[PDB]
């Protein structure tokens, strides 16, 4: 399985977004006989540098290891010097925008589905002992109206204060359990249709509030069972948090309950 791609197979489209290292484009990956495949193209501002190249291509290295229907897929790589990472395109874009715009077109069942799908991706990473460290609505991508996928593994295992677990803020401890806390904040974001947590609150006051037992309130229309799951994700003691395996099974049930 060779990930090196011929540049002539790639057609660059417009700029779609930005990363640490440069502009992200949409585009096309072309193959003989095949249909034209839409793709995302990560660009590297200073790929002439060995230093800058390494951290850039590290995300691709990290994606290389994963294979899951709700995690964005590495298509390939071009190491010739306009260095490019070719990723699967999620044509509907970032989840937060999607939820803000498509609010009156979505139902509670679609929101729980996204949460379930993401829990599915997170269990899978949990089984590989991979910690994402940046679970948030902005980093989730919409592949279809019934399909979200987790992206942006700039931060990895093997600062987003308002999403972080207390032991990550206090002691730089990053684990599956701290991912669970973040997922809980992400679920709140989904149910709030892409409102940010702790608006009008300073990053440095976030820990104080969390230490005082404060938690994001129950979104309008959120079912009590679901909010109950979210508060469990926000146990101060990381050992009382459910694992992504537990969450996935609970979200399945809650989703079925809401469809019925």
CB 126 within 8 A of CB 176: yes
DSSP label at residue 94 = B
Cβ(198)–Cβ(234) below 8 Å: no
- Residue 162's nearest CA partner among 142, 140, 141, 137 is 137
The residues, ordered by sequence, that sit 6+ positions from 40 with a Cβ below 8 Å of its Cβ are 16, 24, 25, 26, 27, 86, 87, 88, 89, 90
| Shared domain check, 179 and 211 | yes
Q: What is the CATH number of the domain that holds 15?
A: 3.30.200.20
Strand, coil or helix: 135: coil
Binding residues: 16-22, 42, 88-90
Same domain, residue pair 37 and 9:
yes
- Rounded Cα–Cα distance for residues 8 and 149 (Å): 28
Q: Which residue has the tokens 């070719």?
A: 86
Give the Cβ contact number of residue 13 at 10 Å: 15
Give Cα 29 to chain centroid, integer Å: 24
Domain that holds residue 71: 1-89
- Residue (of 75, 178, 164, 84) closest to 122 by Cα position: 178
End position of a domain, from candidates 71, 89, 107: 89
Cβ count near 6 (within 10 Å): 11
CB atoms within 10 A of CB 98: 23
Domain end, chosen from 30, 61, 89, is at 89
The verdict on 94 and 168 lying in the same domain is yes
Beta carbons of 141 and 72 less than 8 angstroms apart:
yes
Co-location of 46 and 68 in the same domain: yes
Q: Quote helix, strand, coil % in the chain, to nearest 5.
A: 45, 15, 40
The DSSP-derived string for 176-227 is: HHHHHHHHHHHHHHHHTTSPPTTTT--HHHHHHHHHTT------TT--HHHH
User: Is 152 one of the catalytic residues?
Assistant: no
* Helix (H) / strand (E) containing 139: none
Q: What is the resolution of this structure in A?
A: 2.3
Indicate the number of domains in the chain.
2
Q: What angle do CA 240, 245, 246 make, to 5 degrees?
A: 50
Among residues 50, 134, 152, 237, the one annotated as catalytic is 134
Same domain, 84 and 181: no
Annotated binding site for ATP: 16-22, 42, 88-90
Nearest-angstrom CA–CA distance, 117 and 246: 14
| Whole-angstrom distance, CA of residue 69 vs CA of residue 156 | 19
* Chosen domain end from 89, 122, 138: 89
Method by which the coordinates were obtained: X-ray
């Amino acid at each position: 399985r060779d990930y090196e791609i011929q540049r002539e197979r790639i057609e660059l489209g417009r700029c779609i977004g930005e990363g640490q290292f440069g502009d992200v484009h949409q585009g096309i990956y072309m193959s003989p006989e095949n249909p034209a495949m839409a793709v995302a193209i990560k660009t590297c501002k200073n790929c002439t540098s060995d230093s800058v190249r390494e951290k850039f291509l590290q995300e691709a290295l990290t994606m290389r290891q994963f294979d899951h229907p709700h995690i964005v897929k590495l298509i390939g790589v071009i190491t010739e010097n306009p260095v490019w990472i070719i990723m699967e395109l999620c044509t509907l874009g970032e989840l937060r925008s999607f939820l803000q715009v498509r609010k009156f077109s979505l139902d509670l069942a679609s929101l729980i589905l996204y949460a379930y799908q993401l829990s599915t991706a997170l269990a899978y990473l949990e089984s590989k002992r991979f910690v994402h460290r940046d679970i948030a609505a902005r980093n989730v991508l919409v592949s279809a109206t019934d399909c979200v996928k987790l992206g942006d593994f700039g931060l990895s295992r093997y600062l987003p204060i308002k999403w972080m677990a207390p032991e990550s803020i206090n002691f730089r401890r990053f684990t599956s359990a701290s991912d669970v806390w973040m997922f809980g904040v992400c679920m709140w974001e989904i149910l709030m249709h892409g409102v940010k947590p702790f608006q009008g609150v300073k990053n440095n006051d976030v820990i104080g509030r969390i230490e005082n037992g404060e938690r994001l309130p129950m979104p309008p229309n959120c079912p009590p069972t679901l909010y109950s799951l979210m508060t469990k994700c926000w146990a101060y003691d990381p050992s009382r948090r459910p694992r992504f395996t537990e969450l996935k099974a609970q979200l399945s049930t809650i989703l079925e309950e809401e469809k019925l």
